[PDB]
Amino acid sequence: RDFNNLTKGLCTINSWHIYGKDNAVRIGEDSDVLVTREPYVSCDPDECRFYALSQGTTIRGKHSNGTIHDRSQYRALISWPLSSPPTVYNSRVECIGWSSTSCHDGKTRMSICISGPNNNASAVIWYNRRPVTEINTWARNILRTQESECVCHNGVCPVVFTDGSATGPAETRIYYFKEGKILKWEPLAGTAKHIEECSCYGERAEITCTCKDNWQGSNRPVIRIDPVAMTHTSQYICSPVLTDNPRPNDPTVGKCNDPYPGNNNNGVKGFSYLDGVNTWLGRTISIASRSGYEMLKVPNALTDDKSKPTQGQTIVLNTDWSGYSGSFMDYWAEGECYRACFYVELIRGRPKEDKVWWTSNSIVSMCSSTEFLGQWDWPDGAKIEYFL
Amino acid sequence: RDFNNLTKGLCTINSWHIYGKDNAVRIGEDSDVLVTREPYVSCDPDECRFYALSQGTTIRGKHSNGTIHDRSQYRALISWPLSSPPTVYNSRVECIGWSSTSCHDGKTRMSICISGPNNNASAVIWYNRRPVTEINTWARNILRTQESECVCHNGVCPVVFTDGSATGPAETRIYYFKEGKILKWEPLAGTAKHIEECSCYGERAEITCTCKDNWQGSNRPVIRIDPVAMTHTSQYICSPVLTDNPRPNDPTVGKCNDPYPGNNNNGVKGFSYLDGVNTWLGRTISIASRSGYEMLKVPNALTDDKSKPTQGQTIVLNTDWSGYSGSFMDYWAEGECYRACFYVELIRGRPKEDKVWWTSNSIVSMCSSTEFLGQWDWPDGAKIEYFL
Amino acid sequence: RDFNNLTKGLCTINSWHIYGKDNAVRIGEDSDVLVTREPYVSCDPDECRFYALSQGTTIRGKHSNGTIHDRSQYRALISWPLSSPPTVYNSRVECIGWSSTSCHDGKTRMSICISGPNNNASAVIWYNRRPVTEINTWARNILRTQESECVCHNGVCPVVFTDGSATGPAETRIYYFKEGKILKWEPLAGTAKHIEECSCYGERAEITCTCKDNWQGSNRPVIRIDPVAMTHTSQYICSPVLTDNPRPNDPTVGKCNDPYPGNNNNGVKGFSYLDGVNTWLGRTISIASRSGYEMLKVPNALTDDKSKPTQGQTIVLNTDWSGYSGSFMDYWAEGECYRACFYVELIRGRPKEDKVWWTSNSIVSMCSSTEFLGQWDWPDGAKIEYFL
Amino acid sequence: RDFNNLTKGLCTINSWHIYGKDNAVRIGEDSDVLVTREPYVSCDPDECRFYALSQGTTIRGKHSNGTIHDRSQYRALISWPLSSPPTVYNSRVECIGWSSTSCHDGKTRMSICISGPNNNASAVIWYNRRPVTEINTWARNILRTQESECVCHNGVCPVVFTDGSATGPAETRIYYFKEGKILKWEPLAGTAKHIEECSCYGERAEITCTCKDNWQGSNRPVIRIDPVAMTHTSQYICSPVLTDNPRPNDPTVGKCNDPYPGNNNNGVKGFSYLDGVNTWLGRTISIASRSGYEMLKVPNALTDDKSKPTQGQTIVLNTDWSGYSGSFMDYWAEGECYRACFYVELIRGRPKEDKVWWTSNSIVSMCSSTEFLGQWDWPDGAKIEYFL
Ligand SMILES: *[C@@H]1O[C@H](CO)[C@@H](O[C@@H]2O[C@H](CO)[C@@H](O[C@@H]3O[C@H](CO[C@H]4O[C@H](CO)[C@@H](O)[C@H](O)[C@@H]4O)[C@@H](O)[C@H](O[C@H]4O[C@H](CO)[C@@H](O)[C@H](O)[C@@H]4O[C@H]4O[C@H](CO)[C@@H](O)[C@H](O)[C@@H]4O[C@H]4O[C@H](CO)[C@@H](O)[C@H](O)[C@@H]4O)[C@@H]3O)[C@H](O)[C@H]2NC(C)=O)[C@H](O)[C@H]1NC(C)=O
Ligand SMILES: *[C@@H]1O[C@H](CO)[C@@H](O[C@@H]2O[C@H](CO)[C@@H](O[C@@H]3O[C@H](CO[C@H]4O[C@H](CO)[C@@H](O)[C@H](O)[C@@H]4O)[C@@H](O)[C@H](O[C@H]4O[C@H](CO)[C@@H](O)[C@H](O)[C@@H]4O[C@H]4O[C@H](CO)[C@@H](O)[C@H](O)[C@@H]4O[C@H]4O[C@H](CO)[C@@H](O)[C@H](O)[C@@H]4O)[C@@H]3O)[C@H](O)[C@H]2NC(C)=O)[C@H](O)[C@H]1NC(C)=O
Ligand SMILES: *[C@@H]1O[C@H](CO)[C@@H](O[C@@H]2O[C@H](CO)[C@@H](O[C@@H]3O[C@H](CO[C@H]4O[C@H](CO)[C@@H](O)[C@H](O)[C@@H]4O)[C@@H](O)[C@H](O[C@H]4O[C@H](CO)[C@@H](O)[C@H](O)[C@@H]4O[C@H]4O[C@H](CO)[C@@H](O)[C@H](O)[C@@H]4O[C@H]4O[C@H](CO)[C@@H](O)[C@H](O)[C@@H]4O)[C@@H]3O)[C@H](O)[C@H]2NC(C)=O)[C@H](O)[C@H]1NC(C)=O
Ligand SMILES: *[C@@H]1O[C@H](CO)[C@@H](O[C@@H]2O[C@H](CO)[C@@H](O[C@@H]3O[C@H](CO[C@H]4O[C@H](CO)[C@@H](O)[C@H](O)[C@@H]4O)[C@@H](O)[C@H](O[C@H]4O[C@H](CO)[C@@H](O)[C@H](O)[C@@H]4O[C@H]4O[C@H](CO)[C@@H](O)[C@H](O)[C@@H]4O[C@H]4O[C@H](CO)[C@@H](O)[C@H](O)[C@@H]4O)[C@@H]3O)[C@H](O)[C@H]2NC(C)=O)[C@H](O)[C@H]1NC(C)=O
Ligand SMILES: *[C@@H]1O[C@H](CO)[C@@H](O[C@@H]2O[C@H](CO)[C@@H](O)[C@H](O)[C@H]2NC(C)=O)[C@H](O)[C@H]1NC(C)=O
Ligand SMILES: *[C@@H]1O[C@H](CO)[C@@H](O[C@@H]2O[C@H](CO)[C@@H](O)[C@H](O)[C@H]2NC(C)=O)[C@H](O)[C@H]1NC(C)=O
Ligand SMILES: CC(=O)N[C@H]1[C@H]([C@H](O)[C@H](O)CO)OC(C(=O)O)=C[C@@H]1NC(=N)N
Ligand SMILES: CC(=O)N[C@H]1[C@H]([C@H](O)[C@H](O)CO)OC(C(=O)O)=C[C@@H]1NC(=N)N
Ligand SMILES: CC(=O)N[C@H]1[C@H]([C@H](O)[C@H](O)CO)OC(C(=O)O)=C[C@@H]1NC(=N)N
Ligand SMILES: CC(=O)N[C@H]1[C@H]([C@H](O)[C@H](O)CO)OC(C(=O)O)=C[C@@H]1NC(=N)N
Ligand SMILES: [Ca+2]
Ligand SMILES: [Ca+2]
Ligand SMILES: [Ca+2]
Ligand SMILES: [Ca+2]
Ligand SMILES: [Ca+2]
Known part of the structure; x- marks a missing residue:
């Protein structure tokens, strides 16, 4: 109908349902079921769907062998009905590639897929299910994007x-698109020293x-x-409650404008x-691997370098595999505020479970409640032994 | 369009088709086909569909092992086209959980799923396919609901x-919802001493x-x-024709305001x-197990403590497995009266058929006819031996 | 929109495409793919679909054993997209039963399914996907109907x-329905001595x-x-070109008002x-079994007791299995005339191919052309050996 | 809505995405997944889909044996969602036959399928999903058509x-159809000496x-x-960059009005x-077999008999199997020009890979970009060994 405008503030998050x-x-x-990884969730004005990068093979199919690899010519961004699995028969291909983002602007959806060899990748921006714009790699070294939904305003x-x-x-780079066309792009500015896989709301x-x-x-x-001035800033979450993985143990004081040290060249989308x-941080429970998942209320985390948790909720037990996580909200819901939501990728197979030759995942997602709800843990649920 | 109003009375039930x-x-x-249990049927203004709690696995899948269990993180309320089986590819997830209810109010549908551990469950009320309200457990002991459709009025x-x-x-508790929001809730009142799994029309x-x-x-x-005054009453069906299972043999006089004794801590949704x-009672034929199913016309059953059958119809032979049963009607059908309908869950597998490691079911459903139709029996039809 | 009216005459049939x-x-x-038999084709104003009586099991499924049987509680009338196979995932159940008919009146569709034991069957008439009317068996001996589409007028x-x-x-009996309701019914009249499985246009x-x-x-x-006067007449096709199966060899003169003798208690829907x-007769090539299929132009067959063929077209070779056949037309096509169409059921399995324990079929269908087209034969195409 | 008119010129092709x-x-x-060959892509005003000639069997199915053959009664033109595979469950049959074409005129789609024995084939023209016209073979020797989309104008x-x-x-012959009806047909004229499988835009x-x-x-x-005058001309691409297969090595001067010699009775749709x-030629890399695929910018190829490449892009490595290729464009996209697109059929199985008894393919497709994008190669990706 009309472009959506971010007119509401977040609902108060007292728990997650x-x-x-x-x-x-x-x-x-x-x-x-198709083998996938790098999933996310994204809403249209009339439906919310699960998204992910297929590996172009079923889990039981012999071609599942080798899917630990990140970028091949057989991957594609697919979407499928909320809470259904990504099957060969119900998955809709949005675009071809090994890194993506997607979002509805209120009128129609924009989806972006990047494909290519490491030194010659390119992104193609689709809008209303048609290719509209293409951007060639500018640094010739794995052009890559969010791996979760983008957000639109007017x-x-x-x-x-x-x-x-x-x-x-x-x-x-931050690109400002409108109807699949480039309005403007900026280089990153601010104090963030390196950026990959942004989760936005x-x-x-x-x-x-x-x-x-x-x-x-x-x-x-x-x-x-x-998104009106089409400008931005960057910094780090000041809080001592560290949320990347792997990571060192939590200090008592964090860093606002420099990376908190202890672990190099590695991390997980979060x-x-x-x-x-009304600040909540998500993170793996393990400081060493993509294991477990919890939500921690850390009041003023962004600006308070000594902020520590005041409430929390366990999403996945440390004895269960987690993975990537990201944000999304249903901007077309009723009510006076936007209800914060997120998904956690539950990775199964390689490298942690190497008795099988594949790597895939399932998805679990939660949204906020103003109630103080009881908690449950939500594991993938599969028995690897069955696949042997 | 406009909210539906219960303006019609029941059609005369002379038989079931x-x-x-x-x-x-x-x-x-x-x-x-997904492994399920606790099924039901529910109509929208333009379509009637089968509903049930999936176990998050196919029947032939190795994960079918263990599905006799009631509540796991892998269950979800799903719906699928009338008379089709619940397949991985045609099942639509309404919400995540192990106890549910759902109903269309004329404009859109409300679905409710409860999930959680036994001492910390919570219900989330969805309306127009979005989460709107959440209710935390109040007694910390398996918050649970109907397992069949709710009914709306204005x-x-x-x-x-x-x-x-x-x-x-x-x-x-009786909650009165409107557009997924709580208008009011009451504690149970009346002479009913314990309530679980209500079947409504x-x-x-x-x-x-x-x-x-x-x-x-x-x-x-x-x-x-x-539903206008948002008040209620409670009692028991006075009739000597006992309809729970297991149960004692039928007496010649029943009880109107106290449970009829003989069997403790057990029963089946009915x-x-x-x-x-124009009163009809459904029940298993066996007094000991979920076996067989029949419909008995017991005039004034609710208020007459000596009421006995005047007509009847066999739905499932006592030599076949039955299970849960419930009511639903198509409130958007043509005509001057609402046609009473019901479904019977045909349980297969555990605990009665333990040669297989799973528990699932199929569904059979009937609606009333003003004709006096011939009867047939409708078993599940599967041969367990084939699954061995 | 408005009820369809049979305002056009048939197109000239010079061949079949x-x-x-x-x-x-x-x-x-x-x-x-579901095991079926008794298929047909029927059009809605916006789509034409294949119809058939499912056996409630897949062909490869172990429950396919025994599907030679005609009436069980596991059968149902299903429809699916034109030329697709009837799969578990794309088949839409119209109603439950072992004998059916269905037709669109221009506004919506009426479907009829009869179910029951031999001595207590009943038909339930569905309209706009809801049950509206029920008719109990009147002779207590396998109430049965067309097995192909009915036709509507105003x-x-x-x-x-x-x-x-x-x-x-x-x-x-001939029942005249309007919106699923009975307007009137007549007993058969005329010289036809026995009627089963009518194919209408x-x-x-x-x-x-x-x-x-x-x-x-x-x-x-x-x-x-x-259909306006709601009256009818009956007779036999006078022609010596006999079209039932099994049957005696063609005589030189047929019969107009009595069954042509030679074969008792058997036949095939045709x-x-x-x-x-512009008269065309369909028939199996074999006089002994449901083998082969041909179309013969027999001018004035209905009224001329010596009428013999003037043109013809082979549909299925005598070395291939055929079965039931029936008429349907797309009454919502463009143009000035209705294009005659028909389908042939290609039966595979029992009783003719008993190395397998199942009985099913595929469908082939043709429509008329005013051109004089070249002919091809259209067999089922499956190799029974593969199923062993 | 209204018939589409070819009002735009081509976008500048600087690369392919x-x-x-x-x-x-x-x-x-x-x-x-259904076994196919002879695929293509074609757009409707609201969706673009993959098309191909099914072989009426799955790849893993035993009936896949023998699918190297071109024309059987089990083939049909099917379409399915862009980038999904052609499965039994998501494939829509457009018409029955072994050679086809299809295109949307802006209001609705016309699809054409030819079936028959070699000496008695016939084409049936479908419009708005109904058969409208039939054309009998005129030379009694494999009536055949494009194997890719046709194009419409007013x-x-x-x-x-x-x-x-x-x-x-x-x-x-060139037939001019409007609403499935024949307006006019011409015999081929010009200097082209033989025509088969035209790829149009x-x-x-x-x-x-x-x-x-x-x-x-x-x-x-x-x-x-x-298409207004309903007339045409014919010639050959003058360029020395030869694009059929098999073929001789490229000369330094081509031929404008006669076939360039060196290879008889063979070729591939291109x-x-x-x-x-703004001229681009597609071709297999190998001069001997359907291996590899590249796009070459050959300015004025059609009219310049010494034209040679000025830019190029590899689509499929010479160490990978290719096959047929054709043109299509989304005539209903936004913007001021039509974006050139094409697909390449990636043939797997027989005759080149004879360890398996089947022949099928997958599809890869590209469209032009005004950017100068990095290139990647896009192979089928399957390991034949897995099928053994
Ligand atoms: C039914 O359901 C309800 C609703 O969920 C249940 O109630 C919930 O219970 C939760 C578990 O107790 C609880 O979650 C905790 O909240 C704590 C905050 O509340 C407390 O402190 C505040 C502030 O002073 C008080 O106001 C309040 O009253 C409480 O006393 C958090 O602090 C908890 O998180 C910390 O502990 C967990 C382990 O339990 C860690 O996994 C987590 O990471 C936190 O601890 C690490 O991080 C901090 C910060 O740096 C460190 O200081 C600490 O040492 C830990 O650090 C190590 O571990 C991390 C992670 O591995 C590592 O990276 C680091 O290096 C160190 O090695 C926790 O979030 C809910 O708030 C509570 N909800 C409600 C509404 O009450 C109820 O129990 C259920 N009923 C039943 C019967 O089960
Ligand atoms: C073609 O189709 C038609 C249409 O369906 C067929 O006709 C139907 O036939 C049915 C079977 O006969 C019939 O159903 C019965 O109706 C009885 C009521 O009618 C009779 O009594 C009235 C009242 O006086 C008369 O007016 C009328 O004319 C009849 O004479 C019911 O009483 C029957 O139910 C009882 O029996 C069945 C076993 O048959 C039990 O399963 C059932 O539970 C009922 O009996 C138990 O319960 C009562 C009440 O407490 C007890 O008193 C009794 O002892 C039984 O109790 C034991 O069993 C229960 C259950 O296991 C247990 O819990 C308890 O403890 C005890 O152990 C039955 O419903 C249809 O009405 C009739 N329909 C029509 C329209 O006519 C026709 O036959 C078919 N044709 C052919 C050729 O087959
Ligand atoms: C390319 O395609 C075109 C288009 O299809 C091909 O041309 C077609 O060729 C067809 C085959 O020749 C032809 O079909 C036949 O038409 C005959 C009628 O035409 C002839 O007679 C008329 C009338 O005098 C002439 O005007 C006309 O010029 C012709 O001469 C039919 O009579 C044929 O049917 C009979 O034969 C077939 C066997 O071929 C039987 O299966 C069929 O049942 C008919 O014969 C039985 O029935 C009659 C009637 O009672 C009996 O008299 C006769 O003895 C047979 O009876 C036995 O068999 C039956 C069935 O098993 C059994 O029940 C009974 O008891 C007996 O045992 C046939 O229909 C098309 O008309 C023709 N089409 C066109 C447009 O030309 C062309 O060939 C193809 N090109 C190539 C290269 O292949
Ligand atoms: C990142 O991505 C970018 C973007 O894709 C990459 O840059 C591209 O690189 C491509 C490969 O180099 C390049 O493609 C070539 O373009 C040539 C034309 O450009 C050159 O000449 C012009 C004209 O003078 C100059 O202006 C320009 O500056 C260049 O110098 C083509 O000529 C190339 O095609 C020919 O070679 C390939 C093999 O490489 C053949 O397969 C192809 O068929 C062509 O050669 C055959 O045909 C010609 C014509 O008859 C014959 O003369 C020749 O001998 C060959 O003939 C044999 O082979 C054929 C086929 O098998 C056979 O039939 C015949 O009989 C003979 O046996 C080629 O198309 C892109 O243009 C370029 N794109 C851009 C935007 O720059 C960049 O490399 C990537 N980065 C990294 C790090 O990888
Ligand atoms: C069910 O009853 C309510 C009246 O209680 C109907 O609601 C009125 O509907 C009309 C048209 O929408 C409005 O102008 C009135 O204000 C509505 N509501 C109330 C609460 O007064 C409703 O239309 C009835 N539903 C149907 C299907 O007739
Ligand atoms: C089929 O015939 C009936 C007339 O018998 C048409 O019905 C009339 O339709 C118009 C428009 O709906 C009404 O105003 C008349 O009262 C209708 N009915 C009768 C029974 O008089 C009907 O429209 C015709 N169908 C079509 C498609 O033309
Ligand atoms: C473009 C790409 O391949 N991105 C990788 C990502 C990346 O390698 C690291 O962030 C370091 O740059 O790592 C991971 C990962 O699970 O750590 C998955 C991503 N997989 C895919 N998006 N396909
Ligand atoms: C919430 C829950 O687990 N409810 C159980 C129900 C329950 O245990 C008994 O009524 C006693 O309270 O029993 C049964 C049952 O088949 O008897 C199935 C239900 N299964 C599910 N709804 N998942
Ligand atoms: C109602 C019923 O069972 N009808 C039978 C039909 C019938 O038995 C004969 O016509 C004699 O009456 O025969 C056949 C048949 O193939 O000959 C199939 C039908 N199958 C089904 N419609 N299910
Ligand atoms: C009508 C028909 O069978 N056409 C053939 C085509 C043809 O044989 C040659 O062009 C020579 O005439 O060859 C090929 C081919 O792959 O070379 C496939 C086509 N397959 C199909 N369209 N079914
Ligand atoms: Ca399978
Ligand atoms: Ca890091
Ligand atoms: Ca009880
Ligand atoms: Ca007969
Ligand atoms: Ca050639």
């Missing part, structure tokens, strides 16, 4: 891309992105975008909701 | 929940629920709700249509 | 039913049905219905287009 | 057919078709059609975009 879960790996043990949908090294300074005409500093930071870089006292 | 049957277990022996859709013991007094601005007294009663508790002489 | 073919048995050798859709013996006189406000005399006739009975010189 | 890829053979190793959709020898002069009220001279030419014949300096 179950939103969606597809049990993909369980079901896929005996049905035609037709303007900003997207964060990175091209260059994963273990040294790279060239991060919007509220009151501002877009907040919690990304990852793969090079040096165990605290997360944050990019705040003004997210946060930074809203003063 | 076949409405839907999915042969899920038969078909699922060689196709991707936007108000009452739902019965129980939290607390299954073998002693519990805390039953509406006619002439009144909602009748036939539930189950798991603690002491072999006769069924009945809750009648006024239903009835209480409409003076 | 390929319309649809689903290759169900071939494809079903390695995919989830809301009135006549249907032919038979109840009673298959090898002696029975009670045949309409043109210029008249409905012609070519049925089968299972008891004594090798020539086919024909019922012509006036059809014809009786339109003066 | 990835459009769609279904990885059919990979996925089909463990899911219900309701007029020209189609090229060939009937007669594959190794000598044949009877090629339209721009500025002109339709260009790049076909194949199976008899003598290694350069490609080109037919330019005026295409080109002839637009002055």
